Amino acid sequence: PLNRRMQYSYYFPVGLFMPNPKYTTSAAIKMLDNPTQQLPVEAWIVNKN
Amino acid sequence: PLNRRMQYSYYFPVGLFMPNPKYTTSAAIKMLDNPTQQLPVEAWIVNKN
Amino acid sequence: PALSASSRALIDEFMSVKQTHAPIHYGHYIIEEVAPVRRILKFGNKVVF
């Protein structure tokens, strides 16, 4: 009975909209499109494996 | 008989096409090509030599 | 909050440089994992705790 199973709730948003003064905090990421009219669509999460 | 062998099967793709939101994770590799119309046609691997 | 990413570029930048990554981009974001269990990450060999 000491092999109990904890349950932790995990959450993450999907597809938010950033504030209009957009910015970056690191370089060397150049996405070949318009960075002002850019929009999230996905949520690339990581599995257990 | 304690000098057995293994069969580690390997794989690698050849000539995939990247999605149209193209990007980079590092700078300082500048090619003199059209970066949006880029297309792999070979696949350089390493040998054991 | 778990590990998310609104693009694969930000999760590659997080896998490469753990300390100095970009948590917020122009039109994307990434939320690091602050879970009570330290799930070790691995994308190839770029080991991130």
Side-chain angles (χ1 to χ4, degrees):
Chain A
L2 285 185
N3 303 143
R4 334 177 61 90
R5 314 162 168 271
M6 308 302 181
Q7 307 205 359
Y8 305 132
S9 194
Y10 283 55
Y11 81 110
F12 48 93
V14 169
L16 313 177
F17 185 65
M18 300 312 293
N20 197 26
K22 284 163 166 300
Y23 60 93
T24 46
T25 167
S26 311
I29 310 164
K30 316 193 174 314
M31 320 165 172
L32 262 296
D33 50 306
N34 210 0
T36 167
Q37 321 283 342
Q38 195 153 0
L39 194 51
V41 284
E42 283 173 334
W44 292 80
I45 76 165
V46 66
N47 213 2
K48 184 248 171 160
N49 280 308
Chain B
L2 295 182
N3 290 129
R4 334 178 58 89
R5 320 166 155 276
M6 316 299 173
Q7 321 299 120
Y8 302 143
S9 160
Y10 286 28
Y11 78 104
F12 49 94
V14 166
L16 316 173
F17 169 59
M18 296 317 287
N20 226 26
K22 311 192 161 319
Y23 58 98
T24 173
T25 321
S26 167
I29 305 165
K30 188 42 154 170
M31 301 178 175
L32 297 202
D33 297 331
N34 198 354
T36 171
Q37 319 278 354
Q38 274 205 6
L39 187 56
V41 77
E42 76 264 16
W44 302 92
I45 72 169
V46 75
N47 215 320
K48 75 152 289 300
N49 273 346
Chain C
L3 180 53
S4 155
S6 185
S7 159
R8 282 144 98 187
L10 279 83
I11 206 180
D12 302 328
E13 285 259 337
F14 174 68
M15 282 311 260
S16 45
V17 282
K18 184 212 176 319
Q19 176 72 19
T20 74
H21 77 91
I24 285 166
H25 212 258
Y26 280 144
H28 300 261
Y29 47 90
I30 164 161
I31 303 98
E32 288 188 30
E33 189 174 324
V34 290
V37 50
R38 270 85 177 91
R39 180 178 34 160
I40 176 163
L41 291 172
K42 202 166 68 60
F43 267 68
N45 315 108
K46 303 201 293 304
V47 172
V48 172
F49 296 97

PDB file of all heavy atoms in Angstrom, chain B residues 16-42:
ATOM      1  N   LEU B  16      12.677  14.663 -47.487  1.00  0.00           N
ATOM      2  CA  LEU B  16      11.423  15.192 -46.972  1.00  0.00           C
ATOM      3  C   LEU B  16      11.261  16.651 -47.371  1.00  0.00           C
ATOM      4  O   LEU B  16      12.217  17.327 -47.748  1.00  0.00           O
ATOM      5  CB  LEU B  16      11.380  15.086 -45.456  1.00  0.00           C
ATOM      6  CG  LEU B  16      11.873  13.775 -44.876  1.00  0.00           C
ATOM      7  CD1 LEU B  16      11.921  13.928 -43.392  1.00  0.00           C
ATOM      8  CD2 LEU B  16      10.944  12.659 -45.260  1.00  0.00           C
ATOM      9  N   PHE B  17      10.037  17.151 -47.268  1.00  0.00           N
ATOM     10  CA  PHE B  17       9.750  18.541 -47.588  1.00  0.00           C
ATOM     11  C   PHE B  17       9.284  19.245 -46.327  1.00  0.00           C
ATOM     12  O   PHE B  17       8.368  18.772 -45.651  1.00  0.00           O
ATOM     13  CB  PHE B  17       8.695  18.650 -48.678  1.00  0.00           C
ATOM     14  CG  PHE B  17       8.177  20.030 -48.873  1.00  0.00           C
ATOM     15  CD1 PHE B  17       9.036  21.059 -49.201  1.00  0.00           C
ATOM     16  CD2 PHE B  17       6.830  20.297 -48.747  1.00  0.00           C
ATOM     17  CE1 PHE B  17       8.558  22.333 -49.392  1.00  0.00           C
ATOM     18  CE2 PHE B  17       6.344  21.569 -48.941  1.00  0.00           C
ATOM     19  CZ  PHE B  17       7.211  22.588 -49.264  1.00  0.00           C
ATOM     20  N   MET B  18       9.906  20.355 -46.022  1.00  0.00           N
ATOM     21  CA  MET B  18       9.555  21.068 -44.805  1.00  0.00           C
ATOM     22  C   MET B  18       8.257  21.846 -45.007  1.00  0.00           C
ATOM     23  O   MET B  18       7.914  22.188 -46.142  1.00  0.00           O
ATOM     24  CB  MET B  18      10.680  22.015 -44.402  1.00  0.00           C
ATOM     25  CG  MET B  18      11.953  21.290 -44.046  1.00  0.00           C
ATOM     26  SD  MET B  18      11.607  19.844 -43.037  1.00  0.00           S
ATOM     27  CE  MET B  18      11.173  20.627 -41.489  1.00  0.00           C
ATOM     28  N   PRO B  19       7.503  22.097 -43.938  1.00  0.00           N
ATOM     29  CA  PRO B  19       6.304  22.935 -44.054  1.00  0.00           C
ATOM     30  C   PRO B  19       6.655  24.370 -44.406  1.00  0.00           C
ATOM     31  O   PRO B  19       7.775  24.841 -44.209  1.00  0.00           O
ATOM     32  CB  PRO B  19       5.674  22.840 -42.666  1.00  0.00           C
ATOM     33  CG  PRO B  19       6.166  21.555 -42.127  1.00  0.00           C
ATOM     34  CD  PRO B  19       7.555  21.403 -42.643  1.00  0.00           C
ATOM     35  N   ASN B  20       5.664  25.067 -44.944  1.00  0.00           N
ATOM     36  CA  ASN B  20       5.825  26.431 -45.433  1.00  0.00           C
ATOM     37  C   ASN B  20       6.127  27.479 -44.356  1.00  0.00           C
ATOM     38  O   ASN B  20       6.753  28.494 -44.682  1.00  0.00           O
ATOM     39  CB  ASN B  20       4.590  26.847 -46.229  1.00  0.00           C
ATOM     40  CG  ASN B  20       4.951  27.517 -47.533  1.00  0.00           C
ATOM     41  OD1 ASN B  20       6.020  27.269 -48.089  1.00  0.00           O
ATOM     42  ND2 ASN B  20       4.066  28.369 -48.032  1.00  0.00           N
ATOM     43  N   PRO B  21       5.712  27.321 -43.075  1.00  0.00           N
ATOM     44  CA  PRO B  21       6.371  28.128 -42.036  1.00  0.00           C
ATOM     45  C   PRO B  21       7.793  27.662 -41.764  1.00  0.00           C
ATOM     46  O   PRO B  21       8.056  26.966 -40.780  1.00  0.00           O
ATOM     47  CB  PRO B  21       5.473  27.935 -40.804  1.00  0.00           C
ATOM     48  CG  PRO B  21       4.618  26.771 -41.121  1.00  0.00           C
ATOM     49  CD  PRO B  21       4.400  26.858 -42.586  1.00  0.00           C
ATOM     50  N   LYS B  22       8.716  28.052 -42.634  1.00  0.00           N
ATOM     51  CA  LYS B  22      10.109  27.680 -42.483  1.00  0.00           C
ATOM     52  C   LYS B  22      10.766  28.556 -41.432  1.00  0.00           C
ATOM     53  O   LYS B  22      10.316  29.668 -41.152  1.00  0.00           O
ATOM     54  CB  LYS B  22      10.835  27.810 -43.816  1.00  0.00           C
ATOM     55  CG  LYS B  22      10.094  27.135 -44.944  1.00  0.00           C
ATOM     56  CD  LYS B  22      10.927  27.011 -46.196  1.00  0.00           C
ATOM     57  CE  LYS B  22      10.324  25.957 -47.097  1.00  0.00           C
ATOM     58  NZ  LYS B  22       9.867  24.778 -46.311  1.00  0.00           N
ATOM     59  N   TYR B  23      11.851  28.053 -40.861  1.00  0.00           N
ATOM     60  CA  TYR B  23      12.471  28.701 -39.719  1.00  0.00           C
ATOM     61  C   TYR B  23      13.905  28.228 -39.580  1.00  0.00           C
ATOM     62  O   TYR B  23      14.369  27.356 -40.316  1.00  0.00           O
ATOM     63  CB  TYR B  23      11.703  28.416 -38.427  1.00  0.00           C
ATOM     64  CG  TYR B  23      11.578  26.951 -38.086  1.00  0.00           C
ATOM     65  CD1 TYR B  23      12.445  26.357 -37.182  1.00  0.00           C
ATOM     66  CD2 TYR B  23      10.578  26.171 -38.646  1.00  0.00           C
ATOM     67  CE1 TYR B  23      12.329  25.030 -36.860  1.00  0.00           C
ATOM     68  CE2 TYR B  23      10.458  24.843 -38.337  1.00  0.00           C
ATOM     69  CZ  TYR B  23      11.332  24.279 -37.441  1.00  0.00           C
ATOM     70  OH  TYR B  23      11.207  22.949 -37.129  1.00  0.00           O
ATOM     71  N   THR B  24      14.602  28.801 -38.612  1.00  0.00           N
ATOM     72  CA  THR B  24      15.940  28.366 -38.262  1.00  0.00           C
ATOM     73  C   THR B  24      16.108  28.414 -36.755  1.00  0.00           C
ATOM     74  O   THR B  24      15.465  29.206 -36.066  1.00  0.00           O
ATOM     75  CB  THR B  24      17.012  29.219 -38.929  1.00  0.00           C
ATOM     76  OG1 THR B  24      18.297  28.855 -38.412  1.00  0.00           O
ATOM     77  CG2 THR B  24      16.758  30.693 -38.683  1.00  0.00           C
ATOM     78  N   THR B  25      16.975  27.554 -36.249  1.00  0.00           N
ATOM     79  CA  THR B  25      17.260  27.504 -34.824  1.00  0.00           C
ATOM     80  C   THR B  25      18.649  28.062 -34.546  1.00  0.00           C
ATOM     81  O   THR B  25      18.987  28.397 -33.411  1.00  0.00           O
ATOM     82  CB  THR B  25      17.122  26.076 -34.308  1.00  0.00           C
ATOM     83  OG1 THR B  25      16.000  25.458 -34.948  1.00  0.00           O
ATOM     84  CG2 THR B  25      16.877  26.056 -32.812  1.00  0.00           C
ATOM     85  N   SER B  26      19.454  28.210 -35.591  1.00  0.00           N
ATOM     86  CA  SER B  26      20.752  28.841 -35.437  1.00  0.00           C
ATOM     87  C   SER B  26      21.010  29.737 -36.630  1.00  0.00           C
ATOM     88  O   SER B  26      20.603  29.426 -37.751  1.00  0.00           O
ATOM     89  CB  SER B  26      21.879  27.817 -35.305  1.00  0.00           C
ATOM     90  OG  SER B  26      23.140  28.446 -35.454  1.00  0.00           O
ATOM     91  N   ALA B  27      21.670  30.855 -36.370  1.00  0.00           N
ATOM     92  CA  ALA B  27      22.177  31.699 -37.431  1.00  0.00           C
ATOM     93  C   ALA B  27      23.600  31.269 -37.772  1.00  0.00           C
ATOM     94  O   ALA B  27      24.048  30.177 -37.410  1.00  0.00           O
ATOM     95  CB  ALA B  27      22.108  33.167 -37.025  1.00  0.00           C
ATOM     96  N   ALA B  28      24.290  32.139 -38.519  1.00  0.00           N
ATOM     97  CA  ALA B  28      25.677  31.964 -38.970  1.00  0.00           C
ATOM     98  C   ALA B  28      25.850  30.734 -39.857  1.00  0.00           C
ATOM     99  O   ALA B  28      26.939  30.164 -39.940  1.00  0.00           O
ATOM    100  CB  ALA B  28      26.669  31.930 -37.799  1.00  0.00           C
ATOM    101  N   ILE B  29      24.776  30.299 -40.511  1.00  0.00           N
ATOM    102  CA  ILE B  29      24.869  29.382 -41.638  1.00  0.00           C
ATOM    103  C   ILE B  29      24.075  30.017 -42.763  1.00  0.00           C
ATOM    104  O   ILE B  29      22.865  29.807 -42.881  1.00  0.00           O
ATOM    105  CB  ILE B  29      24.332  27.979 -41.310  1.00  0.00           C
ATOM    106  CG1 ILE B  29      25.020  27.393 -40.086  1.00  0.00           C
ATOM    107  CG2 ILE B  29      24.560  27.046 -42.477  1.00  0.00           C
ATOM    108  CD1 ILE B  29      24.300  26.210 -39.540  1.00  0.00           C
ATOM    109  N   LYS B  30      24.738  30.813 -43.583  1.00  0.00           N
ATOM    110  CA  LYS B  30      24.072  31.536 -44.649  1.00  0.00           C
ATOM    111  C   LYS B  30      24.346  30.835 -45.965  1.00  0.00           C
ATOM    112  O   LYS B  30      25.505  30.681 -46.359  1.00  0.00           O
ATOM    113  CB  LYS B  30      24.547  32.988 -44.707  1.00  0.00           C
ATOM    114  CG  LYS B  30      23.758  33.877 -45.662  1.00  0.00           C
ATOM    115  CD  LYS B  30      22.258  33.614 -45.584  1.00  0.00           C
ATOM    116  CE  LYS B  30      21.454  34.831 -45.993  1.00  0.00           C
ATOM    117  NZ  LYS B  30      20.012  34.495 -46.137  1.00  0.00           N
ATOM    118  N   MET B  31      23.285  30.404 -46.634  1.00  0.00           N
ATOM    119  CA  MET B  31      23.380  29.837 -47.966  1.00  0.00           C
ATOM    120  C   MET B  31      22.933  30.874 -48.982  1.00  0.00           C
ATOM    121  O   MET B  31      22.062  31.698 -48.704  1.00  0.00           O
ATOM    122  CB  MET B  31      22.524  28.580 -48.095  1.00  0.00           C
ATOM    123  CG  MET B  31      22.906  27.489 -47.125  1.00  0.00           C
ATOM    124  SD  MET B  31      21.850  26.039 -47.268  1.00  0.00           S
ATOM    125  CE  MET B  31      22.657  24.925 -46.123  1.00  0.00           C
ATOM    126  N   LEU B  32      23.536  30.833 -50.162  1.00  0.00           N
ATOM    127  CA  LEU B  32      23.173  31.756 -51.237  1.00  0.00           C
ATOM    128  C   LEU B  32      22.108  31.138 -52.137  1.00  0.00           C
ATOM    129  O   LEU B  32      22.235  31.077 -53.359  1.00  0.00           O
ATOM    130  CB  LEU B  32      24.406  32.153 -52.038  1.00  0.00           C
ATOM    131  CG  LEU B  32      25.515  32.919 -51.325  1.00  0.00           C
ATOM    132  CD1 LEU B  32      26.334  33.666 -52.353  1.00  0.00           C
ATOM    133  CD2 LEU B  32      24.969  33.889 -50.290  1.00  0.00           C
ATOM    134  N   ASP B  33      21.036  30.681 -51.503  1.00  0.00           N
ATOM    135  CA  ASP B  33      19.930  30.058 -52.201  1.00  0.00           C
ATOM    136  C   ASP B  33      18.654  30.790 -51.825  1.00  0.00           C
ATOM    137  O   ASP B  33      18.629  31.590 -50.891  1.00  0.00           O
ATOM    138  CB  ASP B  33      19.814  28.571 -51.852  1.00  0.00           C
ATOM    139  CG  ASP B  33      21.028  27.777 -52.287  1.00  0.00           C
ATOM    140  OD1 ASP B  33      21.677  28.169 -53.278  1.00  0.00           O
ATOM    141  OD2 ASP B  33      21.335  26.757 -51.635  1.00  0.00           O
ATOM    142  N   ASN B  34      17.604  30.525 -52.578  1.00  0.00           N
ATOM    143  CA  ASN B  34      16.289  31.026 -52.219  1.00  0.00           C
ATOM    144  C   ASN B  34      15.785  30.215 -51.035  1.00  0.00           C
ATOM    145  O   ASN B  34      15.507  29.022 -51.197  1.00  0.00           O
ATOM    146  CB  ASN B  34      15.343  30.908 -53.408  1.00  0.00           C
ATOM    147  CG  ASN B  34      14.120  31.785 -53.272  1.00  0.00           C
ATOM    148  OD1 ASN B  34      13.902  32.414 -52.240  1.00  0.00           O
ATOM    149  ND2 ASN B  34      13.315  31.837 -54.324  1.00  0.00           N
ATOM    150  N   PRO B  35      15.651  30.801 -49.843  1.00  0.00           N
ATOM    151  CA  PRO B  35      15.377  29.984 -48.653  1.00  0.00           C
ATOM    152  C   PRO B  35      13.958  29.467 -48.578  1.00  0.00           C
ATOM    153  O   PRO B  35      13.726  28.444 -47.926  1.00  0.00           O
ATOM    154  CB  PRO B  35      15.674  30.939 -47.491  1.00  0.00           C
ATOM    155  CG  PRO B  35      16.307  32.157 -48.125  1.00  0.00           C
ATOM    156  CD  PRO B  35      15.748  32.224 -49.498  1.00  0.00           C
ATOM    157  N   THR B  36      13.001  30.134 -49.215  1.00  0.00           N
ATOM    158  CA  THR B  36      11.638  29.620 -49.197  1.00  0.00           C
ATOM    159  C   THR B  36      11.451  28.486 -50.197  1.00  0.00           C
ATOM    160  O   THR B  36      10.674  27.559 -49.946  1.00  0.00           O
ATOM    161  CB  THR B  36      10.645  30.757 -49.450  1.00  0.00           C
ATOM    162  OG1 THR B  36       9.331  30.220 -49.638  1.00  0.00           O
ATOM    163  CG2 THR B  36      11.051  31.604 -50.650  1.00  0.00           C
ATOM    164  N   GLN B  37      12.137  28.533 -51.331  1.00  0.00           N
ATOM    165  CA  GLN B  37      12.088  27.443 -52.304  1.00  0.00           C
ATOM    166  C   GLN B  37      13.248  26.480 -52.110  1.00  0.00           C
ATOM    167  O   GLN B  37      13.964  26.163 -53.056  1.00  0.00           O
ATOM    168  CB  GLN B  37      12.080  28.004 -53.718  1.00  0.00           C
ATOM    169  CG  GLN B  37      11.211  29.238 -53.902  1.00  0.00           C
ATOM    170  CD  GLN B  37       9.744  28.908 -54.109  1.00  0.00           C
ATOM    171  OE1 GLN B  37       9.365  27.744 -54.220  1.00  0.00           O
ATOM    172  NE2 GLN B  37       8.911  29.940 -54.181  1.00  0.00           N
ATOM    173  N   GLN B  38      13.449  25.991 -50.894  1.00  0.00           N
ATOM    174  CA  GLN B  38      14.532  25.062 -50.611  1.00  0.00           C
ATOM    175  C   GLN B  38      13.992  23.646 -50.548  1.00  0.00           C
ATOM    176  O   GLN B  38      12.853  23.428 -50.126  1.00  0.00           O
ATOM    177  CB  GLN B  38      15.241  25.405 -49.307  1.00  0.00           C
ATOM    178  CG  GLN B  38      16.329  26.426 -49.459  1.00  0.00           C
ATOM    179  CD  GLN B  38      17.361  26.315 -48.379  1.00  0.00           C
ATOM    180  OE1 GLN B  38      17.322  25.392 -47.569  1.00  0.00           O
ATOM    181  NE2 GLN B  38      18.291  27.257 -48.348  1.00  0.00           N
ATOM    182  N   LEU B  39      14.813  22.690 -50.955  1.00  0.00           N
ATOM    183  CA  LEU B  39      14.341  21.331 -51.134  1.00  0.00           C
ATOM    184  C   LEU B  39      15.492  20.346 -51.021  1.00  0.00           C
ATOM    185  O   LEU B  39      16.427  20.396 -51.827  1.00  0.00           O
ATOM    186  CB  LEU B  39      13.664  21.202 -52.491  1.00  0.00           C
ATOM    187  CG  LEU B  39      12.971  19.889 -52.797  1.00  0.00           C
ATOM    188  CD1 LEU B  39      11.966  19.599 -51.722  1.00  0.00           C
ATOM    189  CD2 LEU B  39      12.296  20.000 -54.140  1.00  0.00           C
ATOM    190  N   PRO B  40      15.470  19.448 -50.041  1.00  0.00           N
ATOM    191  CA  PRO B  40      16.531  18.438 -49.943  1.00  0.00           C
ATOM    192  C   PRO B  40      16.383  17.415 -51.051  1.00  0.00           C
ATOM    193  O   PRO B  40      15.275  16.974 -51.355  1.00  0.00           O
ATOM    194  CB  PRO B  40      16.297  17.797 -48.574  1.00  0.00           C
ATOM    195  CG  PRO B  40      15.252  18.583 -47.916  1.00  0.00           C
ATOM    196  CD  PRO B  40      14.489  19.318 -48.962  1.00  0.00           C
ATOM    197  N   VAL B  41      17.503  17.038 -51.657  1.00  0.00           N
ATOM    198  CA  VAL B  41      17.494  15.991 -52.655  1.00  0.00           C
ATOM    199  C   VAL B  41      18.517  14.898 -52.351  1.00  0.00           C
ATOM    200  O   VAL B  41      18.470  13.828 -52.968  1.00  0.00           O
ATOM    201  CB  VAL B  41      17.709  16.598 -54.061  1.00  0.00           C
ATOM    202  CG1 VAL B  41      19.151  16.958 -54.296  1.00  0.00           C
ATOM    203  CG2 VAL B  41      17.121  15.725 -55.166  1.00  0.00           C
ATOM    204  N   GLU B  42      19.399  15.109 -51.385  1.00  0.00           N
ATOM    205  CA  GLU B  42      20.341  14.091 -50.955  1.00  0.00           C
ATOM    206  C   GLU B  42      20.211  13.881 -49.453  1.00  0.00           C
ATOM    207  O   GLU B  42      19.388  14.513 -48.790  1.00  0.00           O
ATOM    208  CB  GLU B  42      21.759  14.488 -51.354  1.00  0.00           C
ATOM    209  CG  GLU B  42      22.373  15.571 -50.489  1.00  0.00           C
ATOM    210  CD  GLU B  42      22.230  16.962 -51.064  1.00  0.00           C
ATOM    211  OE1 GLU B  42      21.410  17.147 -51.979  1.00  0.00           O
ATOM    212  OE2 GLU B  42      22.947  17.876 -50.602  1.00  0.00           O
TER     213      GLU B  42
END
